[PDB]
Design a protein around this ligand. Structure first.
Ligand code: LEU
Ligand code: CL
Ligand code: CL
Ligand code: NA
Ligand code: NA
Ligand code: NA
Ligand code: NA
Ligand code: ZN
Ligand code: ZN
Length: 499
């Protein structure tokens, strides 16, 4: 688990497989960002003609008898006056991939000189650490013979004092243990990550942390609470649903309580409104909202933030079969709101609705933040690298946007358009579960908002349908499950709730 170390002296550093040298780009030419031993400079002179120091650019070369490390990566950081946290995070993520592909296990990273820049050492180190940790991850693999890329085992940052660097490193490492859990849960087979498995994961977290308690509802208990929207989605499933409540009481004397809700559809066939095969292929990802809540709670308990947080995960497959809930029928949530089914493939908002009602009935929330791979319309709206979110509270939205900016997990607020609430109109129910216009992400958000039933709680909804899972690898995330949102929300809670 411990990966990153600080080392003050360049001269007293230990041998490592690789050395990462930082460069700026100055007038389209590579420019050393730190003081480099002139013997090392001669070694990579050959490589400078095709390396200009553009951000994330790398050049790989071998050392010689005059260098300690026998592999050398030149890493571009871009223009020095334009250096940013996302630039640093993405550059060291890129270097991590290069190092691992070169089969390196130990790395020395020379820290640049940034004293002349308004960019702080703390911010640089935080993003260096996050970029390395993000791409030092392996998604699960099942090959008959293990084929996975080797991990980096030790990464030493040269030129910083242990006091400043190590506190940052250990914090990011504990946070990324939660990120990795999220990624593992999303990546793993849907036949393995069932609703029961999600409950077992939550029970294991509660077992591990004295600060965490858990409550698990099976199908019978879901029906006893009258959560008929979750029960309807689960009706046809061949595995039993679960409703999972995690409680972290880090500030028992405060009434301030954050409720996190994660959509846990462990496989989404679409139901009777069956998805086309090519649309169904990745649908083990449809529980990424739930996995995000679990990963946040892992980091929350490890970091021991002094705040109160409750996690709520409705979990079920959305199956097709003889007992599947019906197109055109009306189902009723636990407070009596009725929902006419326009599409069984709009099932996530149903189970979130009962979870929201549950939160308001039992958890006295100050704010509710939900996470869901909710709509295809969101991927059309904002693509795979920016997640849209909705919020009924401008402070909450501004805070989440600031946390997004500072962690590099890109969010973009979208509007809760009042004119589109009528798009959910039903003649026979409080609402339909799909809107009559084309703005599917907005009407899905407006649907969730109904379940606040005019309670004044602050609420934000993150539609991670695009960012949760990448079929094409894109910085700063691995291929497939990204873990998007875990880092952003831990930073939000630490910065805006815990002080
Ligand atoms: C026009 C499209 C929505 C058609 C789709 N196959 C459906 O009937 O649900
Ligand atoms: Cl169809
Ligand atoms: Cl708030
Ligand atoms: Na680990
Ligand atoms: Na516990
Ligand atoms: Na359809
Ligand atoms: Na995606
Ligand atoms: Zn669906
Ligand atoms: Zn779904």
């Amino acid at each position: 688990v411990v990966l990153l170390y600080s080392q003050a002296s360049w001269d007293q550093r230990s041998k490592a497989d690789a050395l990462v040298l930082p460069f700026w780009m100055k007038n389209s030419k590579a420019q050393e960002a730190a003081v480099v031993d002139e013997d090392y400079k001669l070694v990579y002179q050959n490589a400078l003609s095709n390396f200009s120091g553009k951000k994330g650019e790398t050049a790989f070369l071998f050392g010689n008898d005059h260098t300690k490390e026998q592999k050398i990566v030149l890493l571009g950081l871009g223009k020095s006056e334009e250096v940013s946290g996302t630039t640093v995070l993405e550059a060291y993520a890129q270097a991590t991939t290069v190092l691992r592909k070169a089969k390196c296990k130990t790395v020395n990273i020379l820290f640049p000189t940034i004293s002349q820049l308004r960019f702080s050492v703390e911010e640089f180190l935080t993003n260096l650490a996050a970029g390395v940790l993000s791409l030092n991850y392996n998604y699960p693999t099942y090959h008959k013979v293990d084929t996975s890329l080797p991990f980096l085992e030790k990464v030493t940052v040269i030129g910083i004092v242990s006091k400043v660097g190590d506190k940052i490193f250990r914090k990011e490492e504990s946070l990324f243990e939660g990120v990795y859990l999220t990624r593992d849960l999303v990546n793993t087979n849907a036949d393995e990550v069932t609703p029961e498995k999600l409950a077992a994961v939550a029970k294991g977290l509660a077992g591990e942390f004295a600060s965490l308690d858990v409550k698990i509802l099976d199908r019978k208990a879901i029906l006893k609470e009258k959560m008929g929207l979750l029960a309807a989605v689960a009706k046809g499933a061949a595995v039993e649903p679960r409703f999972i409540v995690l409680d972290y009481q880090g500030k028992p004397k405060s009434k301030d309580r954050t409720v996190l809700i994660g959509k846990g559809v462990t496989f989404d066939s679409g139901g009777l409104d069956l998805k086309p095969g090519k649309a169904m292929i990745t649908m083990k990802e449809d529980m990424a909202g739930a996995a995000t809540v679990l990963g946040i709670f892992s980091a929350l308990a490890s970091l021991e933030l002094p705040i109160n947080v409750t996690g709520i995960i409705p979990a079920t497959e959305n199956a097709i079969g003889s007992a599947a809930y019906k197109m055109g029928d009306v189902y009723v949530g636990m407070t009596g709101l009725s929902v006419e089914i326009g599409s069984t493939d709009a099932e996530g908002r149903l189970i979130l609705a009962d979870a929201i009602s549950y939160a308001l009935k039992y958890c006295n929330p100050t704010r509710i933040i939900d996470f869901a791979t909710l709509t295809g319309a969101m991927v059309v709206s904002l693509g795979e690298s920016v997640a849209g979110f909705f919020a009924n509270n401008d402070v909450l939205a501004r805070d989440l946007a600031e946390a997004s900016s500072e962690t590099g997990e890109a969010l973009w607020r979208m509007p809760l358009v009042e004119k589109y609430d009528q798009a959910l109109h039903s003649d026979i129910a409080d609402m339909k579960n799909i809107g009559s216009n084309r703005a599917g992400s907005i009407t899905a958000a407006l649907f969730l908002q109904r379940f606040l039933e005019d309670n004044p709680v602050a609420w934000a909804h993150l539609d991670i349908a695009g960012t949760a899972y990448h079929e094409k690898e894109e910085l700063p995330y691995p291929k497939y499950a990204t873990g998007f949102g875990v880092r952003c929300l831990i930073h939000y809670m630490e910065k805006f709730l815990s002080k």
